[PDB]
Amino acid sequence: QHQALVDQLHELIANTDLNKLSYLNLDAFQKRDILAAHYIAKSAIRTKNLDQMTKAKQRLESIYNSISNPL
């Protein structure tokens, strides 16, 4: 379970690289939300904090889905 979650997070972090999302014209608040979630995700992974890894996964999945789909 731990490794599965780390893999899911790493995939989501890769899929929310800001430079690769230029074409979506994200607002500054959205970019900040992504940067913050990346930092939380990385920090949660390094410390094996499963609750925070879970939080970050749901957050990044939510962001990726929303910015990729109609308002």
Side-chain angles (χ1 to χ4, degrees), residues 1-11 50 53 57:
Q1 297 88 356
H2 177 265
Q3 191 62 60
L5 187 53
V6 174
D7 290 349
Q8 291 173 315
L9 280 169
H10 280 152
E11 177 169 49
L50 287 163
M53 289 169 69
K57 183 225 181 225

Side-chain angles (χ1 to χ4, degrees), residues 19 23 35-36 66:
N19 296 315
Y23 73 109
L35 296 170
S66 69

Side-chain angles (χ1 to χ4, degrees), residues 5-6 10-11 14-16 21-22 25 28-30 33 35 37 39 45-46 48 53 55 57 63-65:
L5 187 53
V6 174
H10 280 152
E11 177 169 49
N15 287 341
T16 54
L21 300 179
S22 303
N25 311 325
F29 87 82
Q30 294 175 290
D33 287 342
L35 296 170
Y39 171 61
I45 292 165
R46 323 169 72 129
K48 299 180 171 189
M53 289 169 69
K55 174 185 181 278
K57 183 225 181 225
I63 292 171
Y64 180 67
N65 179 73

Side-chain angles (χ1 to χ4, degrees), residues 22-44:
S22 303
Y23 73 109
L24 296 173
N25 311 325
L26 303 178
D27 294 328
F29 87 82
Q30 294 175 290
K31 296 181 190 189
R32 288 154 73 94
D33 287 342
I34 291 169
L35 296 170
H38 282 0
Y39 171 61
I40 290 159
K42 169 179 156 45
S43 302

